[PDB]
Amino acid sequence: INFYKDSYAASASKQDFSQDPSKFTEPVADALKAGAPVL
Amino acid sequence: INFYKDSYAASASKQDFSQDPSKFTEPVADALKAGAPVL
Amino acid sequence: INFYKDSYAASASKQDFSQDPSKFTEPVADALKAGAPVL
Amino acid sequence: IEEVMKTVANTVESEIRAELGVIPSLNAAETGATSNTTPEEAIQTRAVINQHGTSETLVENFLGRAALVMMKDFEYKNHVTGTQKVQQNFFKWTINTRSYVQLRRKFELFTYIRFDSEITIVPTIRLYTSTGASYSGLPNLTLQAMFVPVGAPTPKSQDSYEWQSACNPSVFFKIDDPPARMTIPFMCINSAYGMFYDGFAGFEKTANGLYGINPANTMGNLCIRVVNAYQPVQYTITIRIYLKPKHIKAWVPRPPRTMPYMSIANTNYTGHSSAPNNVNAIVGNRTNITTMPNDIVT
Amino acid sequence: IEEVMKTVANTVESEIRAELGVIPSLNAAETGATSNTTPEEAIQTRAVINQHGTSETLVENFLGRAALVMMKDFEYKNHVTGTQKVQQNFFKWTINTRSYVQLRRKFELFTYIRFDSEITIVPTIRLYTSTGASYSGLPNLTLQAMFVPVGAPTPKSQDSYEWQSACNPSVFFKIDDPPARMTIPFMCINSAYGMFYDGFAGFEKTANGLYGINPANTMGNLCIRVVNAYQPVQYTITIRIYLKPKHIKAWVPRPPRTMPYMSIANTNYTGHSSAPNNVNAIVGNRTNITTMPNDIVT
């Protein structure tokens, strides 16, 4: 329920389930495989 | 939401994006071009 | 908005634009013309 | 005929007229007809597309406004003290619409009106000023307004047993709430209410006492009490009733009242001691029929 | 032409220009036209897709804000004591919109404005401090604000009979409620309200007293009273009226006011004793035309 003209007045948008743990956990130039020896 | 009979009772009409800066900035009889020498 | 069962509970009916100025201004047996001499 | 008029009439262009046998500006008031001379045949007019609306002056909008119909104050204390054995924290009103001249004169512009009544009850409260008049705020009391039709028993005390109102409709409303509101239907026994009755309300031919009393204008009584028992201090309750008519239908317009009213039961008149609104002089006097009173001094 | 501008203009790329007969940066202020030199022909610009909106600065949004238009206090007691025979628990205000300079200067940016008025009434209450000023809380009083057009009778007392308001619109609102609110329509006799009137309001040629008084700015009176009868203690009622315009249309923009206002009836000016906002010096003084007052000390 939003009866205000300005869209910023709306309720919270608690719905964005996308994730990308890889910018922080694996931020390397060459992608690391699984079980393969790192370096 | 307007449940009143008189139309003047309604909310504000903050929606008229048309503009005409030319009645004030160039109110001359002969239209001025761009780069051409004025007079 | 009227959620009452009895129709007399409703809002005012300020909408009857019909007029008949002739029962009061010309309540005569013989209709008077325009410009023609009355009697 | 009957025409629908959302706006007023336009003006059309007019031209020089010099015709034999055509006399638009000549009339005959004896026929009882108002003159039909239009502006376009009186003078040489221009065209004017006129968009002035006529909605504000509709009868429904002319009469459909809340106006004061009753106002009465009463004491809220313990009246049992003394020689009075009855609590008496209440009052009774016989419903009439001729007590306050503003609404009355507006209604008497017509002979018959049919309308539903939107009733609004506005209570106010004050604290009586006497001796120990140490202010302590206004209590939030609940009041009961009971409609009592003709023939129903009427309460004689605040603690009477007529206040159960098994059949009489009642409203219980508090001081701090919005005003109480309810609609009374068109409740006449005839097709319309009569603002004027040129007759008598009794079959018996009494010498006096029954002229102008309409038999159908017996709407009954409004009784209002305080539900709470008396407090140790005395308060004054003022009840104002506003009537708004709606769904209005009006017939037979009448000359407006010019003399001040004197009673709620008759059309008796006396006027003022001098003009304006005097029995010999409704309009104020000017020096002579050749005198502008407000004349531009050029 | 007329263009719809949800955002501001983009900037396009520009390149080296060395042309004969083309002088974009040269203008002629005598024609009355503002310079048409664009940034892309003054300097070598990059492209910029610009998404800055223009909605906040619309005239409807510039003027459509509630501002104080009237504020007045009055005493709520029993004034009948003494040599005064009139209750006088009320006040009367002749409606004007030139009393408070904040709203006034914002309106006088245009010659004509057409708008509907959203009126909000904000009551406050205090208890008068004198002798027996033992606090007991603020009563929940009901107030009546009655609009009185030109020519209508005006109340002379709290208990006057003009307060029935059979035709005059009234609002009954309590202290503890939300502020009262109603919309007044665009109620001018002309197509728009005039913020300035270069003329006289009377056909008669009096020496003085009628310059700048607009004949159409006669909106009438606002009368506000306390419905309750007087309490044993005295209270002070303060009424603040907020005006919000809506559905606004504005024509003919004007230079903003720079001198402080002196009256609500004329444009008389005196300024301050020294710059800024002085009749000889609107902007404050710097030492010379070669002096930055706020200069970075590198």
Add this chain to the structure above:
Amino acid sequence: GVPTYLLPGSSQFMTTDDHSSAPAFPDFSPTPEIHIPGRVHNMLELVQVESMMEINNVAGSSGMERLRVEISVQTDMDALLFNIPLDIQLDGPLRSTLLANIARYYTHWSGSMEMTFMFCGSFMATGKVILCYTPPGGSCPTDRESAMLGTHIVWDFGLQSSITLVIPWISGSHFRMFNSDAKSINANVGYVTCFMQTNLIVPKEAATSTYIIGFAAAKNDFSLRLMRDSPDIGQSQQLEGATAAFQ
């Protein structure tokens, strides 16, 4: 539940509000409507009906004497007979008409009016009068040469006993006002004056004095705005029997 909040102006009682409200007598059956003559739908139907003007509103004139103007045989040509102040808010000849009694319930007005005059002399009396309307801006014309320069109609007494002088709507603004300032641009309407065009002529045995009745009305282009309380009535005390209704 529905999440809500309360706006300013909640709980107010405004005497011009328009809402449904609870029916106090449920399933009540109102009396069926019968046909009654003279239904009024609009108040502009009424102001279009003519009514007599107190043109002779002077001291000495009592009752019906005020509704009639004496016209008598002149001994001076071009003579001024009477004038009518064209105002509705202030006290004047128009203030007696049904037009002015309905109009005074409103603040603004527009449109053309009409004044009808009726000759009530003997059959053998002849005469010619000129009735002139002067748009505002100056003083009232006191001589016929100055008065005939505006809107006028020359009335010749004959078999048709009524003349109509239409007051055309000549205003700068769309609407005028019922202001207390009669000398205001938004309120002043003008003047109406009557002069002898030729004379009243009567035989030897006929009466040398005769009467005119004057009537005024609105026309079909007339409109009223901004309803107010009329200054034509007011209370000072409770009426007789008003407080007896509580006992």
Add this chain to the structure above:
Amino acid sequence: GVPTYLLPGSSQFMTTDDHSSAPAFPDFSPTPEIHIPGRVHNMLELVQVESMMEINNVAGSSGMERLRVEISVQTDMDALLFNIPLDIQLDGPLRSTLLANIARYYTHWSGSMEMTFMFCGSFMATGKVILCYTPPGGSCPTDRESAMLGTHIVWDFGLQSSITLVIPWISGSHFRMFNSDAKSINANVGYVTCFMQTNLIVPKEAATSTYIIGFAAAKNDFSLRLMRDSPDIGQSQQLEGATAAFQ
């Protein structure tokens, strides 16, 4: 009934709320709109109109003397003529313009401005001036060799009497502020300085001193945000006749 509950902020009056509210005059018919020239839809239409700058805002200069800058024949080349503080919130030459009077009703701004200068000397007077805009970061240039390193335009007096120096939008952030701190990163805009390019040259009989008028305006990319109360006006007491309205 409908089960409801009240949210926080119920019963508040917020001066920027936007709701319908009860019509006080029901069935009122407003006067029909006629065409009136000069309709304004947006306030950015107005700031695009040029207005004179009080460049000569010094003691001794009174009234119109402040709106004009004297340019006179130099005896020293490369001479500094004047400078203009590029600020709108503080007291400066821009504070007189319609641009600055509308902009000061808002807190944030963005977009390019323009300053137009007009030569009002005699026909026989010739000259060349350079008008330089310096992006912020350091002190104002006091020598021409340092000043010409930024954005500049060389104005040659001729048959076209006006030159335009565009102040390009060169800001780190998308918007700036009308802060009281002129030395702030979010507020400082830069400097505008004028130097003699060659000289003013006049014949033997012509006047050796001449005037420039300076104008400033916004361009089509200019925008304003976060409307506030302008510091250009204020009350201290009730105005004359303000309390007379209650009697």
Add this chain to the structure above:
Amino acid sequence: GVPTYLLPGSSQFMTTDDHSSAPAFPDFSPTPEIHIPGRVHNMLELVQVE
């Protein structure tokens, strides 16, 4: 009018409620978003970092 009634918990302020509320700056235009590296959508992205 609409016949209504008030439930328990009306007029409460609960710090975890989720409703619209009145815009204080009407027609305000926020600064357009630019790309900034390192956007976090969930806090479980962070606890996965050693």
Add this chain to the structure above:
Amino acid sequence: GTHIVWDFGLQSSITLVIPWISGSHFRMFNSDAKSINANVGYVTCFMQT
């Protein structure tokens, strides 16, 4: 009456047309200059600025 305002510039000549404004179709070269059939009018020059 009929007039033309002459501003000295690059064009050195102004033209004041005497329009034919006569009651009759023709006029006369009468010895009576004050006659209805002969008098034509006047031409006057004033400093504008």
Add this chain to the structure above:
Amino acid sequence: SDRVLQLKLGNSAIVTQEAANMCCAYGEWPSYLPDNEATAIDKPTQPETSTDRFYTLKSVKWEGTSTGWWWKLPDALNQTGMFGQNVQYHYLYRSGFLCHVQCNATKFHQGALLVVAIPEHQLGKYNTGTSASFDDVMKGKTGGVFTHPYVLDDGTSLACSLIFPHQWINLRTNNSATIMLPWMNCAPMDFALRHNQWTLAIIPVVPLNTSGGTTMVPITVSIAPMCCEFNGLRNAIT
């Protein structure tokens, strides 16, 4: 091409060889009142060649101490010609105006004039509470002079007055200014003797410098009413 201009109205014509341009106020042209907007119902009189023609007022002398001049734009003509007579005999008036301002000098003279037309210039008074009197504002064809032109005698500012329709007369470039004014009013028509729609103001923003040449430099104003019409004929009042 745009430096020469000839204006012809009725039996009057004006030429100029050093015009700047023509200023049409708010991009508008005068026109008669349409039936869509009219309110007075009587047939208007529309004298065209007898009213819509240039009226040249008395000249004012431009000195070094001059503060400026203004003319209330109907009021300046109410006593002049057939326009004035129609104004006197009729209650209601409507017109535009075409305002031409003449001021010529040499190539050694210098100075600038702001020719600005102010709609509804309600005149203020300095350092007093009482409003301006009838004489202070109804100056007629003579016009008035500004007391404090820097605030337009109005507590506003001269600097912002360029929002109004205006032209300049820069002596080094042009010697005339022309502004064409439509009907400015809320109402369809007005009583010409008690309300002024326009004020033509002439303000010397850059002061005149003769530099040994001719000293008497006069400024001349010629105004032509445009599309005049009148309603409510009656006797003449002045």
